[PDB]
């Protein structure tokens, strides 16, 4: 079947030229809505959800973890490394990276989640221990985000990314103040005001991290406290056929506009 929300989100893919993925989990009755669910996308920058979750559950085990110092060298510097670039010679904690990476989008950071988890290979393995079969991290910083169509490395696809973050920041996958720490990072992120928050109710709480990379890739995925109702969690991936195509966070903001219209 094809709901009318489904119809909407096609109408609006059509329009846009490009490839758009969508899942929402209501938890107030666990129902889904998909548009392309189980397709595959390129996650780029909203896999740092997953590395600084990974993160958060080895420090259930090490209550100084996230105050382990991490060396930042000239040599570790990638591409985006607001945060990271002003503690060259210097350190960061694992809270700050953590923080960095998910707030800022800082790459640098990420790459020392990553490597705090032994490579992307282990970040992928917290997935597969937290239920989520599809996730998968192949490389680190910054070719994680060069979104190839068709590419299966660095992808997930969006009813897998939905669940996984319900379970991480709703659900138990962590530890009640893991999970706690977890919300308010994603609640302070910089990034995301003209992405799904663009098309939500100015009402609604969002906490979210975004993403962007190769063919026009430009992604968000989302918890939303709206008011007087229980949260939803949206995944909104769009990915475009040409490797220069450009940005286009307005339509992350049209698929949360119907989806919202829809409940
Ligand atoms: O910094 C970025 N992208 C980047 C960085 C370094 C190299 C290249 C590159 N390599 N080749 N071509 N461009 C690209 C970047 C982009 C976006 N964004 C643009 C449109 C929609 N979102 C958002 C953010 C932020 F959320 F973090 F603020 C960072
Ligand atoms: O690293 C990147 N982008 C980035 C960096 C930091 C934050 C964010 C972000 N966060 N939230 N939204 N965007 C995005 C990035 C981008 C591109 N690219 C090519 C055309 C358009 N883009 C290519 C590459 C790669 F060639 F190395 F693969 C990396």
Not at 7 to 33: F, M, Y
Request: charged share 20%; with cysteine.
């Amino acid at each position: 079947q094809t709901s009318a929300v489904q119809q909407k989100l096609a109408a609006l893919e059509k329009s846009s030229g490009g490839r758009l993925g969508v899942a929402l989990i209501d938890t107030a009755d666990n129902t889904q809505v998909l548009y392309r669910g189980d397709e595959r996308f390129p996650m780029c920058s909203t896999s740092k959800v997953m590395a600084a979750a990974a993160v958060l559950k080895q420090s259930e085990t090490q209550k100084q973890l996230l105050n382990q110092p991490v060396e930042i060298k000239h040599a570790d510097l990638v591409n985006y490394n607001p945060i990271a670039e002003k503690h060259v010679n210097g350190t960061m904690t694992l809270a700050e990276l953590s923080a960095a990476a998910l707030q800022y989008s800082d790459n640098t950071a990420m790459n020392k989640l990553i490597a705090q988890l032994g490579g992307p290979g282990g970040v992928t393995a917290f997935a597969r221990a937290i239920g989520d079969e599809t996730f998968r991290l192949d490389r680190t910083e910054p070719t994680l985000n060069t979104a190839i169509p068709g590419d299966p490395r660095d992808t997930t696809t969006p009813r897998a990314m939905a669940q996984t973050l319900r379970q991480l920041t709703l659900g138990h996958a962590l530890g009640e103040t893991q999970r706690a720490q977890l919300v308010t990072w994603l609640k302070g992120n910089t990034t995301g005001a003209a992405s799904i928050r663009a098309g939500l109710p100015t009402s609604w709480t969002v906490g979210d991290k975004t993403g962007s990379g190769g063919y026009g890739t430009t992604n968000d995925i989302a918890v939303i406290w709206p008011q007087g109702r229980a949260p939803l969690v949206l995944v909104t991936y769009f990915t475009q056929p040409q490797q220069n195509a450009e940005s286009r966070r307005d339509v992350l903001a049209s698929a949360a506009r119907i989806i919202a219209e829809g409940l």
